[PDB]
Write an enzyme that holds these catalytic residues in place. Structure first.
Site, PDB file in Angstrom:
ATOM      1  N   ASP A  78       2.958 -24.911   3.288  1.00  0.00           N
ATOM      2  CA  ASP A  78       4.053 -25.752   3.989  1.00  0.00           C
ATOM      3  C   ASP A  78       4.506 -26.821   2.810  1.00  0.00           C
ATOM      4  OD1 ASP A  78       5.415 -27.546   5.454  1.00  0.00           O
ATOM      5  OD2 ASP A  78       3.822 -28.487   6.535  1.00  0.00           O
TER       6      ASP A  78
ATOM      7  N   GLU B 113       9.898 -22.151   8.668  1.00  0.00           N
ATOM      8  CA  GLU B 113       8.739 -23.046   9.282  1.00  0.00           C
ATOM      9  C   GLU B 113       8.466 -23.189  11.076  1.00  0.00           C
ATOM     10  OE1 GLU B 113       9.635 -27.273   8.080  1.00  0.00           O
ATOM     11  OE2 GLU B 113       9.684 -26.438   6.080  1.00  0.00           O
TER      12      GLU B 113
ATOM     13  N   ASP C  60       9.380 -30.095  16.464  1.00  0.00           N
ATOM     14  CA  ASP C  60       8.671 -30.226  15.374  1.00  0.00           C
ATOM     15  C   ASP C  60       9.192 -31.696  14.696  1.00  0.00           C
ATOM     16  OD1 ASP C  60       7.969 -30.610  12.770  1.00  0.00           O
ATOM     17  OD2 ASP C  60       8.407 -28.429  12.176  1.00  0.00           O
TER      18      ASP C  60
ATOM     19  N   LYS D 232      13.064 -32.606  -1.169  1.00  0.00           N
ATOM     20  CA  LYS D 232      13.468 -31.512  -0.366  1.00  0.00           C
ATOM     21  C   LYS D 232      14.809 -31.801   0.406  1.00  0.00           C
ATOM     22  CE  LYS D 232      11.832 -28.668   3.717  1.00  0.00           C
ATOM     23  NZ  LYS D 232      10.394 -28.639   4.330  1.00  0.00           N
TER      24      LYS D 232
END
Ligand SMILES: Nc1ncnc2c1ncn2[C@@H]1O[C@H](COP(=O)(O)OP(=O)(O)O)[C@@H](O)[C@H]1O
Ligand SMILES: [Mg+2]
Ligand code: NA
Length: 378
Positions: A7, A172, A196, A68
């Site tokens: 991850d 994800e 999430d 990211k």
């Protein structure tokens, strides 16, 4: 030779391995099961992970994070232009590609986002190798479901730079569903909601699973809501409390604020399991020690509007998927911020008392599922 699941998170990364019939999430050098997605450059060293985050107050211009948010994007992308204004490090344009420019060993250097992410991946690879005792070369890496082909390519490239053979890039929320064994259904459609709430982002996904095939039915969320915003609410509260008690305003001193922020992130974690937390920072400002405390109730008040706002994207996702609450079969908690009890209560109440899947540490679920998938593909 075991393959690993990684991850590669906006704020924290995590690595797992499937071995002897079970997934192990691998702790790093400092004993931590997740690792900050930070890289720092100094006059003598490149620091990655905990070591980089731990010196951010000392060295802000040369400590890089949030890569990211840049990866696979063009410099003129409105997201890049907007995000830039809140980073202490410099982003420059090299042919409509963003690069981060830092000082390292006394020279100015610039790196593409995938080069920065490759450094975090190298650390994750090293953590895995130290635990397994042999070199690892195969990996599954996860990305958000909304990443486009350019963002996926750049992520794969980051893995290649780090010495990995990337078996697959998987989403994800899919990884999280796999961690809980939800890919095994039999015939029949099952609808799964992944909630999430991470360090910088909030993602809601509705997946339909049918004979082990995944379809993303709807996604919603907020790319600038996460744990960092809760930390900032605590910072602001304590800046005010310092001003009352000591009639001084520390808000101008960037180092004092960064040290306070570190302390608040720690206190916040404590409040997920205790109803009170202490803050002790020596010499916070002009020699004054700041020793204080905060209750869970006060933390919940300071963040109540933010916590409540997480339900609107849930409502939106249900609408776009054309599903009622009752048609969601499983609710899965992902992201470190879902450890906060008030957030769990809000989601459970919204779903009329339904069980939440939360037996896997939510900040580890994505790596866990990636690790399972990696072993299958090998
Ligand atoms: N026990 C806890 N209580 C509250 N927040 C937590 C806890 N543990 C981790 N967090 C928060 O989780 C966030 C990171 O979430 P995580 O899912 O690990 O990262 P990412 O969003 O980068 O994938 C940070 O804001 C961190 O402070
Ligand atoms: Mg995450
Ligand atoms: Na993460």
């Amino acid at each position: 030779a075991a393959a690993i699941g990684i991850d590669l998170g906006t704020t924290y990364s995590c690595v797992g391995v499937f071995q002897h019939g079970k997934v192990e999430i691998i702790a790093n050098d400092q004993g931590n099961r997740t690792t900050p997605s930070y890289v720092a450059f100094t006059d003598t060293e490149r620091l990655i992970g905990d070591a980089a985050k731990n010196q951010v107050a000392l060295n802000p211009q040369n400590t890089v994070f949030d890569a990211k948010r840049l990866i696979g994007r063009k410099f003129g992308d409105p997201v890049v232009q907007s995000d830039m204004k809140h980073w202490p490090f410099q982003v420059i344009n090299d042919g409509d590609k963003p690069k981060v420019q830092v000082s390292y060993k006394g020279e100015t250097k610039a790196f593409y986002p995938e080069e920065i992410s490759s450094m975090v991946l190298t650390k994750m690879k090293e953590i895995a190798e130290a635990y397994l005792g042999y070199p690892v070369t195969n990996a599954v890496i996860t990305v958000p479901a909304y990443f486009n082909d350019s963002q996926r390519q750049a992520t794969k490239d980051a893995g290649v730079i780090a010495g990995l053979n990337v078996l697959r890039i998987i989403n994800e929320p899919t990884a999280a569903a796999i961690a809980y064994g939800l890919d095994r259904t039999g015939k029949g459609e099952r609808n799964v909601l992944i909630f999430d709430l991470g360090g910088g982002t909030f993602d809601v996904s509705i997946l339909t699973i049918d004979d082990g095939i995944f379809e993303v039915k709807a996604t919603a969320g907020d790319t600038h809501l996460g744990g960092e915003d809760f930390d900032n609410r605590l910072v602001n509260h304590f800046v005010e409390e310092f001003k009352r008690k000591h009639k001084k305003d520390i808000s101008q001193n960037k180092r004092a604020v960064r040290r306070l922020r570190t302390a608040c992130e720690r206190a916040k974690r404590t409040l997920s399991s205790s109803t009170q937390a202490s803050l002790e920072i020596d010499s916070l400002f002009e020699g004054i020690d700041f020793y204080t405390s905060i209750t869970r109730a006060r933390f919940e008040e300071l963040c109540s509007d933010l916590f409540r706002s997480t339900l609107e994207p849930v409502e939106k996702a249900l609408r776009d998927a054309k599903l009622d609450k009752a048609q969601i079969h499983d609710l899965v908690l992902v992201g470190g911020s879902t450890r906060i009890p008030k957030v769990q209560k809000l989601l459970q109440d919204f779903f009329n008392g339904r069980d939440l899947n939360k037996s896997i540490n939510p900040d580890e679920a994505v790596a866990y599922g990636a690790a399972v998938q990696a072993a299958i593909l090998l």
